[PDB]
């Protein structure tokens with residue numbers, strides 16, 4: 240019966256109203272206070288626009304949601320409210336909806352972002368230490384607040400590179416951690432999904448976000464994005480297996496008494512570990528340091544219980560200059 | 566050319582006067598302000614007394630030093646002055662000497678200590694987490710201040726168990742860390758000496774104190790003190806080898822291009838690792854937890870560069886309740 244190694248009793252000790260998001264009653268704001276200026280994204284669950292707050296002429300981000308069940312949207316709203324003001328967490332400013340159709344919109348603070356596909360090739364060795372340190376502040380914060388993000392990936396990390404400012408966004412897949420609870424494993428996006436999700440281990444915890452972080456981080460230092468590129472969920476486990484090796488996978492499956500579907504087992508096969516250094520090449524040589532490698536190594540562990548916690552990660556010597564700069 | 570992974574440039578960036586202890590001029594205090602009340606210890610370098618400050622009737626500790634070279638005592642005095650007021654560091658209150666013979670005495674804040682041989686059998690599982698957390702505060706502090714203690718052991722950790730207060734004492738073997746400097750390896754006390762000292766690796770750093778901490782910690786959780794019990798310095802390496810295994814030793818000697826004296830090599834022999842769990846027994850079963858073991862495991866590494874830093878150690882999930890209690 241797997242449990243988190245840290246922050247396990249956070250929601251135990253909070254008032255029930257903190258985590259009982261189904262008992263929330265949304266305080267709808269005024270749809271007219273916010274005007275759409277330009278569309279900047281679309282997704283299965285929404286369309287996203289740059290907008291303005293008419294009252295104060297401030298930019299904002301407006302997420303127009305496609306039809307969504309009451310229970311699902313209250314969970315997202317409650318978690319945003321719970322974390323609002325925390326280190327590098329996106330700020331939810333307002334919640335509104337169209338009177339005729341009841342379509343709800345979520346209103347957030349604006350971030351002058353640069354898509355990671357354009358931004359990450361320009362980051363220096365020091366820059367990556369700095370921004371990952373900023374993203375860990377957000378993860379240590381939401382875990383300490385009893386919440387798992389469950390969709391860490393570059394697409395959900397907004398960065399203003401001029402201001403060197405970062406925000407962790409899109410809390411739609413997030414959940415409250417409760418010891419022993421069995422969660423849906425269809426969360427995160429495929430390339431960032433932890434082995435627990437791929438082998439149907441349902442009683443996972445905050446440590447899933449550290450796997451996802453490690454996937455993102457490996458992509459950045461090796462300039463290979465996504466680092467683990469599977470075509471479907473079976474294939475995702477196979478690509479991991481081919482890097483970490485199947486010896487470590489077998490140990491893991493045995494520890495948690497998991498049995499792989501016969502089909503998956505056949506696809507996974509048998510593989511030796513590929514040492515991190517073998518991913519180094521002329522395209523990433525300026526970023527692959529022994530300290531970067533040691534930190535990555537401690538994130539990308541099959542066993543979720545073995546991974547660095549966010550708190551531990553922040554103290555790794557890889558970030559020592561970021562801390563000194565303070 | 567081994568270097569510290571953290572705090573390597575602390576003395577580089579400080580004014581020279583911080584670390585140039587030879588340039589200190591002692592400001593002798595008044596020998597008469599302090600009266601010896603009772604002797605509480607003796608050692609190769611001094612005799613120690615409980616005393617009183619006559620002016621304010623406060624207890625103090627008075628260390629009467631045996632004859633000592635000027636350079637050696639200035640180093641101890643400067644380091645005490647540099648660290649005074651830091652988390653759980655003993656406070657040096659005054660420095661005085663006898664007019665007729667020039668014998669110097671060091672005057673410290675008093676601690677109502679209980680010798681570890683009497684105190685540690687009464688510590689609970691939680692108590693050990695708590696006091697080791699307090700000792701790590703001191704080590705992270707002095708390392709951050711550019712200083713290695715080089716004699717961590719229970720005898721130099723004063724604890725008032727009633728007040729739950731800890732102080733790290735006896736800075737006589739301590740030194741300033743300077744990148745690339747070659748230090749004397751005759752420091753620490755035998756049972757707490759790191760493999761670097763035992764194989765004559767001279768360019769060691771703060772990480773030596775983490776080996777010593779791990780020795781102390783293993784003694785506490787397993788109730789086997791000292792944990793590594795060698796009769797002489799060769800035998801000390803052999804007892805370690807017989808626990809950590811010689812495979813890890815060979816890797817280590819090869820990494821730092823060290824060659825063992827032929828005699829030592831013969832005594833060391835060839836040995837498999839003895840897993841931590843094999844030290845568990847009915848005498849320590851109430852203290853040996855998987856988290857305690859994971860933390861120990863990460864301290865007691867041949868390679869000084871692999872060991873947890875004090876900063877990292879403080880964030881380990883083993884201490885999570887101590888942190889929550891705050």
Ligand SMILES: CN1CCn2c1nc1c(Br)c(Br)c(Br)c(Br)c12
Pocket residue numbers: 279280281287300302329347348349350351352397406408409
């Ligand atoms: C896909 N695009 C690009 C910029 N940007 C996008 N989606 C965003 C969301 Br959702 C939020 Br919330 C914020 Br804040 C920003 Br900025 C966003």
Ligand SMILES: CN1CCn2c1nc1c(Br)c(Br)c(Br)c(Br)c12
Pocket residue numbers: 605606607613626628655673674675676677678723732734735
């Ligand atoms: C051996 N004994 C027992 C108590 N105690 C001993 N040596 C001490 C030193 Br040196 C200091 Br400095 C302090 Br503070 C205390 Br308390 C000391």
Ligand SMILES: [Cl-]
Pocket residue numbers: 281282283284285286
């Ligand atoms: Cl979407």
Ligand SMILES: [Cl-]
Pocket residue numbers: 528530557
């Ligand atoms: Cl580095």
Ligand SMILES: [Cl-]
Pocket residue numbers: 607608609610611612
């Ligand atoms: Cl002594």
Ligand SMILES: [Cl-]
Pocket residue numbers: 854856883
């Ligand atoms: Cl525990």
Ligand code: NA
Pocket residue numbers: 329347408409410
């Ligand atoms: Na968002």
Ligand code: NA
Pocket residue numbers: 655673734735736
């Ligand atoms: Na002392």
